[PDB]
């Protein structure tokens, strides 16, 4: 198969293919090279560009899955096939293994993985890309090196001020409250909300907001955060300000997590899981949170007697997003 090089244009032959994902929004396979490769097939309108392909071409980060190649197939009808870097595990599978084993994920792994998620969101938002599907199933992780990579940019979109966008987006457990309220003017801070849900899930061993419907998803959030004020509703969807919603007391933040949950981990959760989207931490601000202070200490290593993954190789563009946080992000050493 002749395929164009991912990162300039450009001969590919693969082996050991297997279907690991079906349904609408495409079909996903795995392949071999002697490397490992992922294939995703989607139906594409020949008259328009593929949104994900243009997104994947624009991005280059150590915490983003690499687009190796891409090629077309007819089927008879055009199908775009995206040749993607293969990563052995997902955060969902690792978390499920720990819960199935009735064990808690060590906080250092939670620290290492969450930092790379927030770093990836800082990068994509700098390039004007909103993931819109941030969930553990879309977080690739290497079991040994503990590097995290963001993938599945099918729902990704460049949110332009003034352009309405679909409200019913993201997976339900990680959907921001303004989306459930039907907001069409939402921003990339919805990715931050989903990242907050992922962090809480890793500390709790189960999703923090397990909604069985759109309405009950908002009920599950209110049971934790309390009923949002009318002013918080105004920033989410001003069409809901004049309803009289029952006032539910907020469950204390320290009372929703386990006894041994670190105090700063709870603090980070409260700073990201905010009703008002503008009050949520920026992805770089989350990286600068004290919850990640261990990763910046001189001498911290992975539990499996291995060094920490790349966490401070920030590019000049990365250094330019929020200059004030760069004192924390790069420690005195390095």
């Amino acid at each position: 198969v002749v395929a164009t090089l991912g990162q300039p244009e450009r001969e590919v032959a693969y082996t050991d293919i297997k279907v690991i994902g079906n349904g609408s929004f495409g079909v996903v396979y795995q392949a071999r090279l002697r490397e490992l490769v992922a294939i995703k097939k989607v139906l594409q309108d020949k008259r328009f560009k593929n949104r994900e392909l243009q997104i994947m071409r624009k991005l280059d980060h150590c915490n983003i899955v690499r687009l190796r190649y891409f090629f077309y197939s007819s089927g008879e009808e055009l199908y775009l096939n995206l040749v993607l870097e293969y990563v052995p595990e997902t955060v969902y599978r690792v978390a499920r293994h720990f819960t199935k084993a009735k064990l808690t994920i060590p906080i250092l792994y939670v620290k290492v993985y969450m930092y790379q998620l927030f770093r990836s969101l800082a990068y994509i938002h700098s390039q004007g890309v909103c993931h819109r599907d941030i969930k553990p199933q879309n977080l690739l992780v290497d079991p040994d090196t503990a590097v995290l990579k963001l993938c599945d940019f099918g729902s990704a979109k460049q949110l332009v001020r003034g352009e309405p966008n679909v409200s019913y987006i993201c997976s339900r457990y990680y959907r921001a409250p303004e989306l459930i309220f039907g907001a069409t003017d939402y921003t990339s801070s919805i990715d931050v909300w989903s990242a907050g849900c992922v962090l809480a899930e890793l500390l709790l061993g189960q999703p923090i907001f397990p909604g069985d419907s759109g309405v009950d998803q908002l009920v599950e959030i209110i049971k934790v955060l309390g009923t949002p004020t009318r002013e918080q509703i105004r920033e989410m969807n001003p069409n809901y300000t004049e309803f009289k919603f029952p006032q539910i007391k907020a469950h204390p933040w320290t009372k929703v997590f386990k006894s041994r949950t670190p105090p700063e981990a709870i603090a980070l959760c409260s700073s990201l899981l905010e009703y008002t989207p503008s009050s949520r931490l920026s992805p770089l601000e989350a990286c600068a949170h004290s919850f990640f202070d261990e990763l910046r200490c001189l001498g911290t290593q992975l539990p499996n007697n291995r060094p920490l993954p790349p966490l401070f190789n920030f590019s000049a563009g990365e250094l330019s997003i929020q200059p004030s946080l760069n004192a924390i992000l790069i420690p005195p050493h390095l």
Partner: peptide, 18 residues
């Protein structure tokens, strides 16, 4: 989809847990 309808379901569900 209608805010009036959605709010009432939210209210009725919220009172069931209050």
């Amino acid at each position: 989809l209608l805010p009036q309808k959605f709010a009432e379901e939210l209210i009725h569900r919220l009172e069931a847990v209050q």
